[PDB]
Structure formats: structure tokens, C-alpha cells
Design a protein around this ligand. Structure first.
Ligand SMILES: [Mn+2]
Ligand SMILES: [Mn+2]
Lengths: 343, 343
């Protein structure tokens, strides 16, 4: 009585055929996973960097950005393992690329899944690994094969459904610290996801029973909270203090809460973080940066896509490309100096 | 690479044909919903009660308990509208009736769903309405037609997935406050559940499709305490009422879990404090949740064979006679409130 109806949904298998992943895309995704694993587990001393737009609403602009990040990745491969941020939505307002690909308030999930997949293929096909946030348990079925890094939404860190999901993904997954500032829920999540799980889920577009093997590559993401920002050494210490033995490295988000809701502070956070890294801090193995071709953000005008400024986020504000180069080169320097403190 | 494999899953439709609901079952489910609605909206001045085991692992024992509650219910029907707790499982490393129906640390979801549906039919068949937690977006499809009340656990009240599910359910849904004791996430969930959603889900035939729901105006908050302490006292209740927007439904207080502090004998103490408020005129308290079984306490696991009869194998519960005394007191508080209101 509360279900208006069901509209047809193309299965992942069908989508994978219409928008096939090139050998390069597959190899790229595989490579991104290996590198991320070695870093969060300490086998590698470079830093894992998830850099990119808060969200992608324009494939062309994303491709130009990707090409720039690719070039700069090759320049800093020795110190950084860069994965492009390819998030589809920011949890009223534009519901994201999957739900509203045309950015016109309509709903076209089938067209959305096609755009999202075309995007993922486009990016990985040039040798650039991507990372996306797992919003639900069904969409990953359509994109996972092209992902090298996944993050679980903060609102679902405590969800068994997402912990089960994580336990079955073929790549590292990050969980955010609780809203109260503590790391319990995230730690529990990582432990839960490490176990094998048995559950019902979509596969061919039908529901089946899944058995996962468990994911040992889950880590905590520091993202500020009710007790303030937590990227500083004091907070980092408190964070490591509550990480049971055998934990993976921590990943720090420069944006959102830790940036005090101001894209301009991301580089300031970079400074405080680079400082720790340069002085020998080995628990910080990753960072998250919201960057785009141009800085800041913009609202969606009455006209729609037609009135949007090119290369400017329509969700959270980002630092521009030039600033991103500065931030990343500085981070790379911090990593280099860190190898020395470890000599 | 982290998916050990899949096993075929009988569809909700198949199981509904296999284990059909009797005309008495459907009628009870319907009635349970109508009565719950009139209460949470303030039409009826009786109190809604969701009483029953933490979980059901023994169908026979559940039936005995049901007969008793059905009889006690007929006695108090003038003051209370009773719905029996018929839950299957919070994940804390027994996996529940759906996963481990044999209570022997194995997995058989197909058999679990059958036992669950049979259980639901058995109970509603004697005229006793039932309530359960809505775990995911799939399992409910196998039981919805028999349910009169649904609950969203504290660990998933923030899950968009569950808010979407609630908006499409044919009965009232209660959202529990967060594990940290935070109430706004539940108030929030009710708002979200109140309107239409468009997302990916599964049909009666087990096919993934795009679902459009209409919104559920019968959602409410369930105070169940948490990390920052219990929340059933007058101060907390007034604090809770303050957060609720205009036109909100009444509150439901959970005597167990966070509000009893892992001590079943605290449930009757909560009942006294809650009764005092009701007896003295508190009209905003429209519901209560109680963890009750034939015999009090709980127990661990020779397998089922060794387990004591009417005793839970999950959260401790108050025994039957305690339950009866608790309910009769609650009933009196109700009658008293009527008198206070006529003034
Ligand atoms: Mn963002
Ligand atoms: Mn319980």
C-alpha cells in the first residue's frame, strides 16, 4: 500500500556488456588495489592519496582533471600513490550522478548507472585508479570491478549491511570515526568486515545468498566530529591509542569536518599533517583531498547544467588544480623526509 | 575475489504460496496496524505495547507464550493494545532464526525464512498481532503481510537504506535513538520516512528493480537509552518531546536494552517511572517495548537439547509473571491518565 511500483532496472551483467571495461581499465584497477594494500599495511612507505572532486556531475570536466592528475601522479610516484576521487553523490539537493545524471531534478537511475560506469571506465582507461564511496549495497555490483578503493558512508558505519558488503569487496575499504569523535564504531566495523559473511543480496539482477571471505584491508578515516578536528598530532595520538593491535594505517580527510567546512583550510591541514609525517609519523598512511580543476563551488541555477561554471563543484567546495599541485608536492616532500627519519 | 560464492534463494512470492497466511492471520495483522495507528496519532488513549522475547529460536515456546499473551491481552484490551515481539535476531559476534534456524552454528537462509514465515503465521493465526525489526530490504518481503509493527534498530536508524524501506512499509515503524543515546537521528529518520523515495530494491519475484515508495506518516521515535545513559525519566521525555516537530506521533519507551542497562530486572523499575508519568497525565508516551519470555534471564548454549525452556538465548528478559504484573500496572496508569485528562 506504500509501494507506488517497480520500474525496470538493467542488470549489472547487461550494463557490463553495454559499457565494457577495457583491458587497461581492469589492469589499472588491479594495480591501484595492490599499491593501496601495501601502503595501509606498511609494506610501502609512500602515502596513499585519494584526490578529486567532492562529486562528479560532468564527465568531460572529470576527464580533463583526470589527465592532469595522471601526469602529476607519474611525477610523484616515488612518494605518493594517487587514486582519483570518483564519488557519485553527496548524501535536499542534487541526488547525484546515478539518480539524476542530467542534473534536472528527474530520476533516471538506468541512465545514471550508465554514466557512472562510462565515467569509471573513462578514468581507469587512461591508467588512473579511482576511489568511490559505497552509498548502498546494490550499485557496487555495477562499478566495483573498476574501483581500487572504497569508503563507507558515515551514516552506515554501524550498519551490518555495509559491514557485510565491505567483507566482500575486492579492495581496501575505509570507515569513518563516529560522529562523537571516537573510533569505536569504525574499529568494530573493520573487525566485523574482516570476517566471512553469509547474506542475501543482488548479484544478473536477481537476489541470491552470498558468502564472502572477509576483508582484512579495512582502515579508519579520521574526519573530525563533535569534539573538533582530529588531524593534529595530539588527536592522531589519541586515535592510534584506540586502534587494537594489528590495525592498518590511518587515513586523514583534509576536507569536510577537518577543514571546518572551508576548502581554503585543506592546505592548512596539509601543513599540520605533513609536519607529523616528516618527523617520522608512520601511522598516517593516507589522506583525502577534495580538489577540482577550479576552486570553490557553485549552486545550480534555474537553467540547469547550461548555466554551470566549468570545472567547479556543485556540491562541496574544492581547492583548485594549482593549489592541488602545491599541496601534493609538499606532501611528497614530507614523505621523502620521512624515509630519512626512518634511515 | 572475496565472494566465496552464491546459493539459490527462494523468492518471497514462492514462500508466500508455500506458507500461506490464513484469513485470521491477515485480519489480525490489519487490526494490529489500525490500533497502533490510532494510538500513536492520539486518536485512542490506550497505550501500544510491543512485548515479547528478545528473539525467537523456539517456535513451540513462542506459541505457548503467545497463548498467554493473547489471553492477558483480552483482559487488558480496554487499556492496552498488545503486539507480540517476534524478532529473529543486534550483531555481536546465535546468528538468528533466519541464518541459523537449527541453532547449531550452521547456515540455511532458505530454511530460516520458512521457519520465520511459519512462526509469523502461527502467532497471528491465534489473533495475536506481531512486530519485528526490519533488518534489510529483502527479508521483510517474506514477512510483511503478517506484520503490524516494524522497528529500525539503533545501529541502522541512520541508514538511508532503512529510511527508504520504512517509507514503503504498510504499517507503523518505530526508529530507535542512536547507540550513543542521540535522539535527533531518530527524529530525523521519521521525517525522511514520511516522504516518497526512489531507489533500487527487490520485488516479490526476487528481481532487482527501481522502487518508488509513497512515504510513511506513521513513524515514531523509540527511546531506548544508550552510551550517555538511560532516557525514560520525565526530564528525558520532556527533552524528547521538545525535539519532536509539530504534528509528530507519540513516543515509545523501550524498557530494555539501553534503558535497563543490560539487567533485565531493571525493566520493571522503568515501568514504574514510566507509569508515574502516564498516570500523572503524560499523553506523549503512547508506546512501550518490553523484552519478555516464559521464564526470566538468558542463557548460552549439546545444542538446543540442553537449553532451558522459556529462556532467551540472546538478551535477558523478565519472566511471564513479572510481565503480567508490569502490564497490569501499565493498564492502571492508563486508566488513571484518562481521569486526569477529563479534568
Ligand atoms: Mn564532499
Ligand atoms: Mn534485544
Amino acid at each position: 500500500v506504500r509501494i507506488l511500483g517497480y520500474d525496470p532496472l538493467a542488470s549489472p551483467a547487461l550494463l557490463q556488456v553495454q559499457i565494457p571495461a577495457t583491458p587497461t581499465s581492469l589492469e589499472t584497477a588491479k594495480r591501484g588495489r595492490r599499491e593501496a594494500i601495501d601502503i595501509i599495511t606498511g609494506k610501502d612507505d609512500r602515502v596513499l592519496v585519494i584526490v578529486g572532486p567532492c562529486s562528479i556531475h560532468d564527465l568531460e570536466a572529470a576527464q580533463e582533471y583526470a589527465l592532469r592528475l595522471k601526469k602529476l601522479s607519474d611525477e610523484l610516484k616515488g612518494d605518493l600513490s594517487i587514486i582519483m576521487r570518483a564519488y557519485l553523490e553527496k548524501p535536499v539537493g542534487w541526488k547525484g550522478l546515478i539518480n539524476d545524471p542530467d542534473v534536472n531534478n528527474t530520476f533516471n537511475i538506468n541512465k545514471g548507472l550508465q554514466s557512472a560506469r562510462q565515467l569509471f571506465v573513462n578514468l581507469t582507461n587512461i591508467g588512473l585508479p579511482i576511489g568511490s564511496e559505497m552509498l548502498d549495497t546494490i550499485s557496487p555490483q555495477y562499478l566495483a570491478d573498476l574501483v581500487s578503493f572504497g569508503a563507507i558512508g558515515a551514516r552506515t558505519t554501524e550498519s551490518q549491511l555495509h559491514r557485510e558488503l565491505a567483507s566482500g569487496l575486492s579492495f581496501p575499504v575505509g570507515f569513518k570515526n563516529g560522529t562523537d569523535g571516537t573510533l569505536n564504531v569504525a574499529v568494530d566495523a573493520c573487525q566485523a568486515a574482516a570476517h566471512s559473511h553469509h547474506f542475501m543480496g543482488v548479484t544478473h539482477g536477481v537476489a541470491a545468498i552470498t558468502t564472502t571471505k572477509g576483508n582484512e584491508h579495512c582502515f579508519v578515516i579520521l574526519r573530525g566530529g563533535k569534539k573538533g578536528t582530529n588531524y593534529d598530532a595530539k588527536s592522531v595520538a589519541e586515535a592510534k591509542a584506540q586502534l587494537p593491535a594489528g590495525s592498518n594505517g590511518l587515513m586523514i580527510d583534509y576536507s569536510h569536518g577537518n577543514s571546518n567546512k572551508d576548502f581554503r583550510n585543506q592546505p592548512k591541514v596539509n601543513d599540520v599533517v605533513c609536519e607529523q609525517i616528516a618527523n617520522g609519523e608512520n601511522a598516517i598512511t593516507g589522506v583525502m583531498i577534495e580538489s577540482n580543476i577550479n576552486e570553490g563551488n557553485q549552486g545550480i541555477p534555474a537553467e540547469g547544467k547550461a548555466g554551470l561554471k566549468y570545472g567547479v563543484s556543485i556540491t562541496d567546495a574544492c581547492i583548485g588544480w594549482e593549489t592541488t599541485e602545491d599541496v601534493l608536492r609538499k606532501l611528497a616532500a614530507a614523505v621523502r623526509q620521512r624515509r630519512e627519519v626512518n634511515k
